[PDB]
DNA sequence: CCGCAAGGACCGCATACTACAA
RNA sequence: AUUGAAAGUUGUAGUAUGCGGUCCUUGCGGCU
């Protein structure tokens, strides 16, 4: 009995949104920023592209957009609420494209563990299109749970 | 051991527009669903729907003397050749739409007025799904089928084999997360396929299935596929046929206010284009007769020439471009 | 990702003004004139609607909008109320038909507005401005506008005069409170 | 089966077109209609027929229909309905029925639905040329093998009534798109290697000449040929998904002149310069005046009425969306 | 002796019953006491007789030689043979072996009786949509008890929420089966399904109408008597049919009705009770019960028949195992 | 398949009656519940059951628990009607008519949204069909009582 | 650089809704 | 040596005809 990706999307989205609410229950600013950035993210992707969106997040963290592995990014090491949220969103989005909801889940990502931004700047347009659609799909679910759970 | 029939023809049906073979309105979110086999959930076109379509086309062709038998078929002359004396009164019935032209009634049976005279010579089987189109992350879409469909195709070949008395005319196992698929569907360096919202692992059959499709429909496939064929498990295939059909909201707009009128919003289901279905058409001895069509073989020949490579419209909503299919009729 | 943007045509790159904005600024300008000239009466007749919104001009404008957008079945009381802009007489009932409601489509088509080809050839259609840099359309750029009647009422003339005035007094686009978006 | 004549309606978008499919719980609140298994943008036959019918109705009620002389429906209804003509006119005026010729061509309104079927079949509008931004050549008219294959099949249907292989990084394109001595084309975010071919584009232009002539919706057909590109199916799918128009709209609260709460949404549009086509099949009317009493007559009325006409399709009409140029190729 | 006829539907079947009480215009034949779908003995006999008759007239009947009925008629009726053969051609009587096996045509009814008694085709397995394994072959204790009784003489406890089902129907780890839109909890059981399959194998052989009987075992679902009855009454196909007035292109006056169908993939069984052939001066190769039984088996085993109405719209086709 | 319909009808009648009882003088609440009941299957058809439940969630959190919802404690008719419909739909999928009846739910007390995230695709499909069916019954009694 | 981050109307209406012989 | 023997509720029949996902809505405010 298999599962659909939608189930994994919803599961992953709930998990990462609950993780923020847990680590920053007293910080409404961090929660409010993450929700704003999750809401903003799909529109940036449609207008500017997924690669430009991932790079846009990294630039907010003042990281070199060419020399950063997503796993190395630890959101709990930033001061302002903005960079904490950007780091979370970048981390969650990259983790989804890279690992999905786990190696033994119904969806283990698209980039086979490779950093999504590095993947984009290395692969073909069709690969990027498939990842772009998937990025939009996971963000839709992140937005859903952020809207209901995260407070301002 | 199928001696009630003598010959059979497989009618391949390829949709080039969405198709709504209807079953009627329901108290449900989908107000107008398409025809389905209830215990499998598979989309079908009932034989009586297809027969009505075939009959109407054949009838119009005979009235316009476009029917080819062996030269042109003049139904009025052949009517006089068969009915002799009372032939004139029969022709008058036809012009009044009380009866149908001679060959039409021989093949499909008499119009409702003469129902008790004799039965029809041909048996129009229900159309069943063979290939169902499903969106794919790579390769745009896949022609999806399953072992139970392949099995039913083989069993129908056994029917044809029994009817034509041709013994010469007469194994796919898959997990639910597995697929046997063409190269165009497979993601770059992953050995996986994503159909709709399901990830399927590629398994190392298609070439043989194509060879079968090449037998029935000729060397060309309806004037056009192995690279986008995907074989999935029976239950996964079933879910696709039930949840990957087109569901469309339609409205009626008040011509003066430019707004949706009351009783003017409903949801309607459509079988997608690029769907391959097939019906088994069995032919028995005519039960009504001119020498040109006095036996089974001659009736088969007329059926093959009349409908092969032809275009038909099946189901409702013809006026909004639905139900258009291309037909291939092979023995 | 630029943090600022501007509507540029997808295929041709020229800046342009969406019909949605043109229709919008014309309707909000209609809201304004009705408020400054007939505010006291409208707020008195529709005291029930006023309570829903809530007491100055900005409360009147919101009340007029709610009347046109939500409670348009109740506009019978001030249907005959007229406004001048400038030498033409436009009634509330005319405004209803021009922009339409949820129960009836608008009788006037508001098309997109585009700069003439001669200007694309002769002068810069874009220039950088500062708030943070952002793209703008320079002063002196001529645009072509159009409205059309789609009913027997033929209200495109009233809509035209209403839109012309809107583009002069209100302006269109962002930062109108700084003088941006004005037309001559 | 009564279809004796077929005419192709070319639809060239002048403004962005929104053939809606209902709201969705996603970033794109109001998406456009798409064929599900391909993801290709479409305009369903029922959406197009409603617009054609509405236009034909307004023209018949204003005596603007020509059959090469004027058409009087009230007079032609008196000749058809006789004693019950005065009753039928009252029904049309009460908007319970539609005028005579409209009901003949498109079928009766609700009250007369069971009387007879419509004479014409309005096919789904299919994508033929999709406008894609191009590094060289400003923008290209892009199509794909699937589209061409469907175009071919639709011709096999029309003729019956009247009685290319590319990899993902390859393109067949006109010279105006190809970079100076690089044999490459850049369409949106995709870099494509030019594949040498000498038949695909040429035959495609020949098809358009057969249908629409030298006049390609306000421009010479020769101008278009230099900017026609064929790409792989995967690439075309990506273009029609990520290069549609996504427009942010708002509703302004008149109180402060700011965006109202829940007053921000996104709408999808087919861009301008999109070429779609629909098969209009015509059969013998089933209801009738001798002026329009057969297939050929209906076809002539359909052509002249809609050829070179400007039509609005889909939603957002009063904010200037959905306007296309129509060419009726017989 | 007796022959058990297994009938497996490959297309939907409409055995029409005018007397059946239903909200459907054209309902299928059902048993009065159980409400189960059935094919009447008389319907089945008519089908069997028509097929047998066609084969005899076409000299395709084998008795291990070719049966020549006109030759046999002359060596049986002697001086009255020519007039009999004339009646056969005049369709007043049927050919010799046909009348021996099924009885004389109505014109000659009083001469002698038919050797066979064709019993009702009783329902055994009824297909129901399953969330897993596409569909289940559904049966009940009352059905199994009827089968066992019919076989024993010719030679289970379940609540409304429980089912004894094969592995291919069971949701992994949940111990549940989902038939259409209802959920049944799996009752642990060791041999009931296995016992049923064995009975089926003893009557119809190793191959289950073109498939191994072991494959069927994994998709059998035994449900309670009330649940089985519910499915057989409310899961049959109910199809609207119309007649189109092609003059208008719309549905003709009085051109709408509803018809019921027994689904494909239904298993039924009929006991054919064979008595001694009753005609006088029988030819030796068919002069007793065993010889009639043998001809019946060879003629109909692995045969395809059409049962009920709607033949020309593809209904009523079944595979036969005898 | 017949007894399950009766069970659905029994639940539907009960929840609509509770709506009409608590908000007898409040026609706005009754009308809102009715509209949302009619729109609900459409949202499910176009977005799936998961998204629809999530959409209802946004109309109300710490955890996804339908039990913890209190529809009467909300300020406006929109949120009150949404909270009621959401709880009704969730209660049916999780509890049915109680464990003393023929149908006691599909998810065994677990919130349907979390249930969808955890179980198989088959489990989600039956929950989707069942959700559509109960809403279809709620729509019947809504039109006749509200 | 910051903020937002949909809502209601319509909700399948009408017609055909057995006919006839054997 | 049974009110018994013998008899296919079957034949003909397109869930179809009519119906625009449309109407109302300024990517803006100046804040974090």
Curated annotation (Swiss-Prot), chain F:
**Key words of the record:** Antiviral defense, Cytoplasm
Coiled coil, from the record: none
The family annotation for this protein states: Belongs to the CRISPR system Cmr5 family.
Source organism: Archaeoglobus fulgidus (strain ATCC 49558 / DSM 4304 / JCM 9628 / NBRC 100126 / VC-16)
- Location (main, coarse): cytoplasm
Its function, per the record, reads: CRISPR (clustered regularly interspaced short palindromic repeat), is an adaptive immune system that provides protection against mobile genetic elements (viruses, transposable elements and conjugative plasmids). CRISPR clusters contain sequences complementary to antecedent mobile elements and target invading nucleic acids. CRISPR clusters are transcribed and processed into CRISPR RNA (crRNA). Part of the Cmr ribonucleoprotein complex.
From the Swiss-Prot or TrEMBL record, give the protein name.
CRISPR system Cmr subunit Cmr5
Q: Which cellular compartments is it found in?
A: Cytoplasm
Biological process annotations from GO: defense response to virus
Q: Which domain of life is it from?
A: Archaea
Which N-terminal residues, if any, form the signal peptide? none
Q: Which GO terms describe its cellular component?
A: cytoplasm
In the UniProt record, does the keyword Cytoplasm occur?
Answer: yes
Nucleotide-binding keyword on record = no
Q: Which gene encodes it?
A: cmr5
Q: Which Pfam families match?
A: Cas_Cmr5
């Amino acid at each position: 009995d298999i599962r659909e990706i939608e189930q994994e999307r919803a599961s992953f989205a709930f998990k990462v949104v609950s993780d923020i609410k847990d680590k920053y229950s007293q910080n409404k600013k961090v929660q409010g920023k993450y929700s704003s950035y999750a809401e903003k993210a799909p529109t940036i992707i449609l207008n500017n592209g997924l690669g430009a969106t991932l790079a846009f997040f990294l630039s907010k963290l003042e990281k070199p957009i060419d020399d950063v592995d997503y796993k190395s990014i630890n959101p709990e090491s930033f001061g302002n609420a903005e960079n904490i949220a950007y780091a979370f969103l970048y981390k969650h989005l990259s983790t989804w494209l890279a690992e999905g909801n786990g190696k033994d889940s119904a969806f283990s990502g698209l980039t086979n563990g490779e950093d999504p931004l590095k993947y984009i700047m290395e692969k073909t347009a069709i690969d990027v299109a498939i990842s772009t659609e998937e990025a939009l799909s996971i963000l839709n679910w992140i937005k859903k749970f952020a809207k209901a759970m995260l407070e301002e | 051991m199928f001696d009630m029939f003598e010959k059979a023809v497989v009618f391949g049906l390829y949709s080039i527009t969405p198709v709504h073979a209807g079953s009627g309105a329901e108290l449900s979110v989908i107000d107008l669903p398409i025809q389905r086999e209830r215990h499998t959930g598979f989309p079908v076109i009932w034989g009586q729907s297809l027969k009505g379509v075939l009959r109407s086309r054949f009838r119009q062709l005979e009235l316009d003397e476009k029917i080819e038998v062996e030269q042109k078929w003049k139904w009025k002359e052949k009517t006089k050749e068969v009915l002799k004396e009372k032939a004139d009164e029969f022709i008058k019935k036809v012009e009044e739409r009380k009866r149908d032209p001679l060959l039409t009634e021989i093949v499909f049976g008499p119009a409702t007025d003469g129902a008790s005279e004799h039965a029809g010579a041909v048996s129009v089987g229900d159309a069943k799904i063979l290939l169902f189109p499903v969106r794919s992350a790579k390769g745009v879409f896949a022609f999806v089928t399953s072992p139970i469909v392949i099995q039913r195709l083989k069993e129908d070949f056994e029917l044809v084999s029994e009817i034509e008395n041709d013994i010469e005319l007469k194994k796919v196992e898959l997990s639910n997360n597995e697929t046997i698929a063409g190269n165009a569907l497979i993601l770059n360096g992953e050995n996986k396929v994503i159909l709709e919202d399901i990830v399927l692992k590629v398994k190392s059959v298609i070439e043989n299935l194509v060879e079968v499709l090449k037998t029935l429909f000729g060397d060309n496939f309806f004037g056009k596929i192995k690279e986008r064929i995907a074989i999935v498990s029976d239950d996964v295939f079933k879910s696709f046929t039930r949840f990957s059909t087109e569901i469309v909201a339609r409205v009626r707009i008040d011509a003066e206010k430019g707004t949706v009128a009351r009783g003017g919003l409903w949801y309607e289901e459509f079988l997608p284009s690029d769907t391959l279905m097939y019906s088994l058409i069995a032919v028995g001895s005519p039960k009504k007769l001119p020498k040109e069509v006095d036996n089974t073989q001659k009736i088969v020949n007329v059926l093959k020439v009349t409908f092969n490579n032809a275009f038909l419209q099946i189901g409702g909503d013809e006026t909004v471009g639905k139900g258009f299919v291309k037909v291939r009729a092979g023995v | 990702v630029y943090e600022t943007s501007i509507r540029l045509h997808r295929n041709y790159g020229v800046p342009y003004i969406p019909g949605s904005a043109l229709k919008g600024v014309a309707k909000h300008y209609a809201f304004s004139i009705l408020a400054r000239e007939n505010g006291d009466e409208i707020l008195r007749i529709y005291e029930s609607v006023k309570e829903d919104l809530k007491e100055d001009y900005y409360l009147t404008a919101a009340v007029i909008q709610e009347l046109f957008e939500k409670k348009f079945d109740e506009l019978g009381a001030i249907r005959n109320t007229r406004v001048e802009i400038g030498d033409t007489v436009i009634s509330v009932g005319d405004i209803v038909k021009i922009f339409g409601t949820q129960k009836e489509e608008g009788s006037v088509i508001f098309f997109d507005a585009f700069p003439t080809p001669e200007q694309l050839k002769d002068k810069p259609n874009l220039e950088l401005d500062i708030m943070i840099f952002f793209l703008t359309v320079p002063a002196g750029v001529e645009f072509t506008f159009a409205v059309a009647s789609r009913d027997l009422d033929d209200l495109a003339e009233k809509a035209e005069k209403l839109l012309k005035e809107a583009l002069k007094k209100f302006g269109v686009g962002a930062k109108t409170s700084l003088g941006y978006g004005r037309f001559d």
